[PDB]
């Protein structure tokens, strides 16, 4: 009904979780994410 802070319907700006961090979750850089960045070393 008002999920505008995410892109859905039912959250009403009161159910927006944040498991990922947009950028990589280990290397520390935006643009890509933990799925795109390999970081195998
Ligand atoms: Zn949402
Ligand atoms: Zn990265």
Distances (CA, A) of 10 to 4, 6, 14, 17: 10, 11, 9, 13
Q: Locate tokens 């009161």: which residue?
A: 14
Q: What dihedral angle (degrees, nearest 10) is formed by the CA atoms of 15, 16, 17, 18?
A: -170
Contacting residues for 9 by C-beta, under 8 A, at least 6 apart: 1, 2, 3
Contact (Cβ atoms closer than 8 angstroms) between residue 28 and residue 21: no
- 23 Cα–ligand 1 center, Å: 19
Ligand nearest to the CA of 22: 2
Return the structure tokens found at 32.
Answer: 């890509």
Q: Cβ–Cβ contacts within 10 Å for residue 21, how many? A: 12
Q: Which domains does the chain have, with CATH numbers?
A: 1-41 (4.10.60.10)
Q: Give dist(CA 35, CA 18) in Å, integer.
A: 16
Rounded distance from Cα 2 to ligand 2 centre (Å): 33
Tokens of residue 29, six digits: 């850089």
- Do the beta carbons of residue 33 and residue 20 sit within 8 Å? yes
CA of 36 to the centre of ligand 1 (A): 23
Distance 17 CA to ligand 2 centre (A): 22
Structure determination technique employed: NMR
């Amino acid at each position: 009904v008002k999920c505008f802070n995410c892109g859905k319907e039912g959250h009403t700006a009161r159910n927006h979780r944040a498991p990922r961090k947009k950028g990589c979750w280990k290397c520390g850089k935006e643009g890509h994410q933990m799925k795109d960045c390999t970081e195998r070393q």
